[PDB]
Coordinates of N, CA, C and O in Angstrom, one line a residue:
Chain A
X430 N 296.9 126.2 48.8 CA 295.8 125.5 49.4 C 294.6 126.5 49.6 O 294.1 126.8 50.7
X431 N 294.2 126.8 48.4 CA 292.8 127.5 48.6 C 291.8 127.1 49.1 O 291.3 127.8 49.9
X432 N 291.1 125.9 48.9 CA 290.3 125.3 49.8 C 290.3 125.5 51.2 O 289.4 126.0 51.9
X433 N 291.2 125.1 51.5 CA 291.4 125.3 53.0 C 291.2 126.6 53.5 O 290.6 126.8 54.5
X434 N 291.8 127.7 52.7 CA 291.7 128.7 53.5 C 290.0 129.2 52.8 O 289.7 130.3 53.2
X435 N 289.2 128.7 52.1 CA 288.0 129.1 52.0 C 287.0 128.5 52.9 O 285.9 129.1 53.2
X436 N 287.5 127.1 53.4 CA 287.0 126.1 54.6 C 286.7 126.7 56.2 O 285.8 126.6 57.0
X437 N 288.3 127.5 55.9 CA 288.3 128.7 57.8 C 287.7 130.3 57.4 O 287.7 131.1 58.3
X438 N 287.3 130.7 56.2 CA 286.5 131.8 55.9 C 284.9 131.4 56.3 O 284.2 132.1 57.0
X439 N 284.6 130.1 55.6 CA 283.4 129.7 55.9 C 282.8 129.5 57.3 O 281.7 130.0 57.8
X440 N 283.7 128.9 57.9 CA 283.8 128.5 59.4 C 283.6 129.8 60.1 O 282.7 129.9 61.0
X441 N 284.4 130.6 59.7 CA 284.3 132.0 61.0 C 283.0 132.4 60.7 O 282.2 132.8 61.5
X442 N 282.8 132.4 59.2 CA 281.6 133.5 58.9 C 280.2 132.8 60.0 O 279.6 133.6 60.7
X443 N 280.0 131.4 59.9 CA 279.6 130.3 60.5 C 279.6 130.7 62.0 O 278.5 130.7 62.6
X444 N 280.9 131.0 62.7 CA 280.8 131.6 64.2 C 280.3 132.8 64.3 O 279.3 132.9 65.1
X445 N 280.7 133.8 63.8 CA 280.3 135.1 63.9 C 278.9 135.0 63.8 O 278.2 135.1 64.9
X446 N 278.4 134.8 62.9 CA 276.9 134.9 62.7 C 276.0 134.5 63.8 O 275.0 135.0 64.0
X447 N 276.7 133.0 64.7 CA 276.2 132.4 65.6 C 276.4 133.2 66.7 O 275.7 132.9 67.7
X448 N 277.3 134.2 66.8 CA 277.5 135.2 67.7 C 277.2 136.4 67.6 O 277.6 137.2 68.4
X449 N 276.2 136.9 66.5 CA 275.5 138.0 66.5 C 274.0 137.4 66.5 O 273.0 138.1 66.4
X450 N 273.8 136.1 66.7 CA 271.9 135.7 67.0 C 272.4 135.5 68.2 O 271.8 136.1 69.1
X451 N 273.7 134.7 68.9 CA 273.8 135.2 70.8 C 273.5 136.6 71.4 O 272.7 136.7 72.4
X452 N 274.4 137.6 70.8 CA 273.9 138.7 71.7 C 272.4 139.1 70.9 O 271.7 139.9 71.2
Chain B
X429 N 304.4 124.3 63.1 CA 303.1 124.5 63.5 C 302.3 125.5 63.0 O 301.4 126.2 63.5
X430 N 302.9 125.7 61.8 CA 302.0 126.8 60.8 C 300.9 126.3 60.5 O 299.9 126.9 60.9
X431 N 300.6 125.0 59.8 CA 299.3 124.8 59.5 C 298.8 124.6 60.6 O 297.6 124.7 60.3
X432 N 298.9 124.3 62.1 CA 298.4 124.4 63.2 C 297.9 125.8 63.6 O 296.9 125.7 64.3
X433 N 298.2 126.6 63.4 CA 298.0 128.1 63.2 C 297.1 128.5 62.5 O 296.1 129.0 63.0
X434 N 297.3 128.4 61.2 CA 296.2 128.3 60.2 C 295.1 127.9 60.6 O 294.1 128.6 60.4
X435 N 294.9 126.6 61.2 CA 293.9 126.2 61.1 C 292.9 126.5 62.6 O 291.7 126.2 62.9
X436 N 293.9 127.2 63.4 CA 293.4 127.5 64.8 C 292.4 128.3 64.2 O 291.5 127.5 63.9
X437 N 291.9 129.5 63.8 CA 290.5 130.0 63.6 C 289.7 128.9 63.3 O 288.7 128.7 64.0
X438 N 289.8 128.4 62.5 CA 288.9 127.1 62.0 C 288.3 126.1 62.9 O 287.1 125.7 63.0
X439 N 289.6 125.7 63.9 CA 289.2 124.9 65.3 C 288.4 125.6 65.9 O 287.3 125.1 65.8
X440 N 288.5 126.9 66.7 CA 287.8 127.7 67.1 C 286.4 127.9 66.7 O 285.4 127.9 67.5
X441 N 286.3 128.1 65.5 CA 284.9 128.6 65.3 C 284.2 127.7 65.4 O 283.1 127.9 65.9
X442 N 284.6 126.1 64.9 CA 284.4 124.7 65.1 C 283.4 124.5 66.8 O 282.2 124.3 67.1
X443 N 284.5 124.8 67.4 CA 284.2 124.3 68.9 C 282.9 125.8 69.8 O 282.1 125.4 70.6
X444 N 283.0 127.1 69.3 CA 282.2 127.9 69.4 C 281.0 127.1 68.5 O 280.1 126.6 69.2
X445 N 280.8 126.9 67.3 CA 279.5 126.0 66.6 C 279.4 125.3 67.9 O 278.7 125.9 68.7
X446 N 280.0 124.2 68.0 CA 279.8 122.9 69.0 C 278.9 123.7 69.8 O 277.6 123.8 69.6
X447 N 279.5 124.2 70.8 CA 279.0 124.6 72.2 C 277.5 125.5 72.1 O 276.6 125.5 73.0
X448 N 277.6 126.2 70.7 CA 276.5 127.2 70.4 C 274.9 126.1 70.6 O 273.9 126.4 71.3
X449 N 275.1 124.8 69.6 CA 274.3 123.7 69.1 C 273.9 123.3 70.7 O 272.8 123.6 71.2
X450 N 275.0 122.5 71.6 CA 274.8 122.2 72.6 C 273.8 123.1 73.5 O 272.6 122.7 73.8
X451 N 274.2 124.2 73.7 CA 273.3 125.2 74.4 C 272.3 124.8 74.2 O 271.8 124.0 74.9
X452 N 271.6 125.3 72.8 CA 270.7 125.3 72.3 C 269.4 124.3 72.1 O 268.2 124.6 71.9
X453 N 270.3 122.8 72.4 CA 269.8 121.4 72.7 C 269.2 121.4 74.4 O 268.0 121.2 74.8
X454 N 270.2 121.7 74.9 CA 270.0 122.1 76.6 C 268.8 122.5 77.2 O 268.1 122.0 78.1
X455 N 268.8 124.3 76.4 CA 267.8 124.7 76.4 C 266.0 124.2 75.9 O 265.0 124.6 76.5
X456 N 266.0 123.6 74.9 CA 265.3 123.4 74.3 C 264.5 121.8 75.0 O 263.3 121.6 75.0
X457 N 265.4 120.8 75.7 CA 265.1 120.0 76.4 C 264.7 121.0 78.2 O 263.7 120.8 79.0
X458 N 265.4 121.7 78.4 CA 264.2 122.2 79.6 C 262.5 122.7 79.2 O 261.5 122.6 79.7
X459 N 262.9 123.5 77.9 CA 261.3 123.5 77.5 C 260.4 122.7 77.6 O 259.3 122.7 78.1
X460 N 261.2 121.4 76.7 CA 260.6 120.2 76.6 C 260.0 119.9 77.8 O 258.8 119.9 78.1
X461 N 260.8 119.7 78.4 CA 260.2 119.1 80.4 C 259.1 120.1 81.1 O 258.1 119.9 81.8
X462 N 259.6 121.2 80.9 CA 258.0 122.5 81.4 C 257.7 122.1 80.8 O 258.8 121.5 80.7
X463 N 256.9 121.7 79.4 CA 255.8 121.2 78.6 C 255.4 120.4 79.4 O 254.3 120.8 80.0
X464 N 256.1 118.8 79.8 CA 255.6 118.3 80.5 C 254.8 118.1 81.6 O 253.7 117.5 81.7
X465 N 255.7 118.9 82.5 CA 255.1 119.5 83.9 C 253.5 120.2 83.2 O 252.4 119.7 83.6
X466 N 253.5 121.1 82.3 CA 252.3 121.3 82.1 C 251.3 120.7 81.5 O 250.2 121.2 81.6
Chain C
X386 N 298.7 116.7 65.7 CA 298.1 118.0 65.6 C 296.4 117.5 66.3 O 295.6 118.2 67.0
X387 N 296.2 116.2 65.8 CA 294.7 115.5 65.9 C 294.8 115.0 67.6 O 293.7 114.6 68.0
X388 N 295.6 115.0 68.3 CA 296.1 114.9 69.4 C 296.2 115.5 70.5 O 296.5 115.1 71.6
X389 N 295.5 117.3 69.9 CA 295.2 118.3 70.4 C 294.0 118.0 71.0 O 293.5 116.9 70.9
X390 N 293.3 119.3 72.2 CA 292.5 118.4 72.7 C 290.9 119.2 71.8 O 289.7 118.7 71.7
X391 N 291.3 120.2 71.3 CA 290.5 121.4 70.7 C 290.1 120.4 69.3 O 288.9 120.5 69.0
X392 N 290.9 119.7 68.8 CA 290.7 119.0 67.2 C 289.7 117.7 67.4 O 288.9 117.2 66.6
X393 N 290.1 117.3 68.9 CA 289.5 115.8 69.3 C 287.8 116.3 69.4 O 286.9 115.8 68.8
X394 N 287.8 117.6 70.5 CA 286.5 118.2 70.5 C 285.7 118.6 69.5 O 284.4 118.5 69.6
X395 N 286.4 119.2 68.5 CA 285.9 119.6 67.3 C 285.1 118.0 66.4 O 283.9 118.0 65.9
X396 N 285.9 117.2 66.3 CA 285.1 116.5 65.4 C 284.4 115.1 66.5 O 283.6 114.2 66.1
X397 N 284.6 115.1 67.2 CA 283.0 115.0 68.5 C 281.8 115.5 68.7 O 280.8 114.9 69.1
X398 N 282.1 117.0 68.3 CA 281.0 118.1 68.2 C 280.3 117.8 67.2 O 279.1 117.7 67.3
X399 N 281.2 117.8 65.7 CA 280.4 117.5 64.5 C 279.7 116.5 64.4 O 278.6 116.3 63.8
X400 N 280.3 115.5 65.5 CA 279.7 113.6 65.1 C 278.5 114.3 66.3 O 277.4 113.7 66.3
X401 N 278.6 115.2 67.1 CA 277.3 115.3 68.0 C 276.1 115.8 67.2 O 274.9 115.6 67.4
X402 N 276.5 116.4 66.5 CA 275.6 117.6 65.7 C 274.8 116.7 64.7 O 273.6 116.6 64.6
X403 N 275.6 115.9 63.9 CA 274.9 114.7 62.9 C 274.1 113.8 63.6 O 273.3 113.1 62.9
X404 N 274.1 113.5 64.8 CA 273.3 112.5 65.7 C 272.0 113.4 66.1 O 270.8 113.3 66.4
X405 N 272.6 114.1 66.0 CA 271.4 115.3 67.2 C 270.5 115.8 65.9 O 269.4 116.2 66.4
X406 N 270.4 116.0 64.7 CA 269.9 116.5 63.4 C 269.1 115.3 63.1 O 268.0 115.5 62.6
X407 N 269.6 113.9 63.1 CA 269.3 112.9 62.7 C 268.1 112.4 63.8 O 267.5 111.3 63.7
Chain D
X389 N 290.5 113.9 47.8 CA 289.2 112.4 47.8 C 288.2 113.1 46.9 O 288.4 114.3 46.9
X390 N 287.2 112.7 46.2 CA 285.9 113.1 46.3 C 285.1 113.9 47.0 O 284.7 115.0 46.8
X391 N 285.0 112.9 48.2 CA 284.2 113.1 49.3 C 284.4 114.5 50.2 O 283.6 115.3 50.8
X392 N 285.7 114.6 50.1 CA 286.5 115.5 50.7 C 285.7 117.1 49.6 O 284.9 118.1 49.7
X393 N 286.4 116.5 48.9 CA 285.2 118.1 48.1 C 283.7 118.0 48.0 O 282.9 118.8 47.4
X394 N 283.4 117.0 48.4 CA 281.8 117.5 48.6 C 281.7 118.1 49.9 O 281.0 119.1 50.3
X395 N 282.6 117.3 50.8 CA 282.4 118.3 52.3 C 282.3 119.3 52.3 O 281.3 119.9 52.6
X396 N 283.5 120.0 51.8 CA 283.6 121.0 51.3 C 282.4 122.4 50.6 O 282.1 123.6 50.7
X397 N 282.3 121.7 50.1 CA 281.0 122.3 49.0 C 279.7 122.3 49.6 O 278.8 123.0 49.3
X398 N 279.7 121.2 51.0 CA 278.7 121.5 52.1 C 278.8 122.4 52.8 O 278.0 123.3 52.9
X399 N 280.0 122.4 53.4 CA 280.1 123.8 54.5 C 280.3 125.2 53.3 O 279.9 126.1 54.0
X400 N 280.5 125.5 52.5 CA 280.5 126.7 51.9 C 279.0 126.8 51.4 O 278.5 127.9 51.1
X401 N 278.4 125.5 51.3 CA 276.9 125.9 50.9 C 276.5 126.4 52.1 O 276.1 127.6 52.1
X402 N 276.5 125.8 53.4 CA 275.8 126.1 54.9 C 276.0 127.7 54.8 O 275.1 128.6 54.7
X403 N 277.3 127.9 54.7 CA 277.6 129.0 54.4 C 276.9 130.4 54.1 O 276.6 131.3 54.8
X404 N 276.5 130.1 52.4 CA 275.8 130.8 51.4 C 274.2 130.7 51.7 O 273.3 131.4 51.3
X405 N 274.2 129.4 52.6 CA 272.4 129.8 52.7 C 272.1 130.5 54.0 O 271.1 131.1 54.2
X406 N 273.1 130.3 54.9 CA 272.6 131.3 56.1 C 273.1 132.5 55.6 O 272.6 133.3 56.4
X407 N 273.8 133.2 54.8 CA 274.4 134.3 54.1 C 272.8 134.9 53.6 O 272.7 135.9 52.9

């Protein structure tokens, strides 16, 4: 299931990023 | 509950998005309203 | 698994996010 | 599905353009 696990790479990259324009 | 696992980072970052958007809406409607006021 | 309360929130969020963009 | 891989190909685009 590659997709999926490229779906939850996307996603984090997605949070993180929103959590380095937070601090 | 492996694919439950799996997919916990995904939920997570999911609901971190959510709440990030929310804030951001929040915020952006008190601006809105001091506009008003002024 | 959709049952969870984290999964229900999640695609609430998304349906909030497409209303709120729209 | 289809649709399923376009979703898909949305969030990895959102991805690559805030990248």
């Amino acid at each position: 299931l590659p997709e999926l696990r490229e779906v939850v790479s996307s996603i984090s990259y997605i949070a993180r990023q929103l959590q380095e324009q937070e601090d | 509950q492996e694919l439950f696992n799996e997919l916990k980072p995904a939920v997570d970052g999911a609901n971190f998005i959510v709440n990030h958007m929310r804030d951001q809406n929040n915020y952006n409607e008190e601006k809105d309203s001091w506009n008003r006021v002024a | 698994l959709i049952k969870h309360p984290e999964v229900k929130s999640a695609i609430e969020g998304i349906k909030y996010i497409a209303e709120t963009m729209k």
